[PDB]
Amino acid sequence: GCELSDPDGLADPMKWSKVPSGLKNGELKVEAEGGSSLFACKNYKSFWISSVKEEGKFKENTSYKEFDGGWYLVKIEDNELKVIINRNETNASRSFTVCVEAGNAFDEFKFVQDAAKQ
């Protein structure tokens, strides 16, 4: 117990017709090449960007559908959210976040890039 809620006033999980197989409960592992991923939403076609992190802490976002973090890039096209990630050429791993809310729910996505081993 110690929870209480309205009997029919909860939020179902946000749901997607397209996701990448690299997703593990919103944690998105990425290698020292970087990749694209596509997140097409089947139940919430109305959301916007309300977090970014690029450096273990959060930062602000210059749009509602886009972000451009230099090596990182976000684009919402109605109901298709994408990220396309550049190659890390550094000897350090680095990590990102993309939280989006659709009013009642938010699926935080937590990207985790690896170091190059060069």
**DSSP letters along 58-108, please?**
EE--SSSSEEE-SS-EEEEETTEEEEE-PPP-SSS-EEEEEEEE-SS-EEE
Nearest to 28 by CA among 95, 89, 92, 82: 95
Spatial distance between the Cα atoms of 59 and 74, rounded to a whole number of angstroms: 14
8 A C-beta contact, residue 97 and residue 79:
no
Spatial distance between the Cα atoms of 77 and 64, rounded to a whole number of angstroms: 11
Residue 48 lies in a domain: yes
- How distant, in Å, are the alpha carbons of 34, 39, 45, 54 from that of 91? 14, 29, 38, 16
Residue 39 lies in a domain: yes
Residue 19 lies in a domain: yes
Residue 2 lies in a domain: no
Give the number of domains in the chain. 1
Residue 27 lies in a domain: yes
Would you give the DSSP letter of residue 7? Answer: T
Quick one: tokens of 105?
Answer: 């729910």
Q: Which residue has the tokens 């117990």?
A: 1
Q: Reduced to 3 states, what is the DSSP secondary structure of residue 36? A: strand
Q: Reduced to 3 states, what is the DSSP secondary structure of residue 43? A: coil
Residue 35 lies in a domain: yes
Residue 6 lies in a domain: no
Owning domain of residue 68:
11-118
Quick one: tokens of 23?
Answer: 């997703």
Residue 103 lies in a domain: yes
Task: Tally Cβ neighbours within 10 Å of residue 114.
Answer: 16
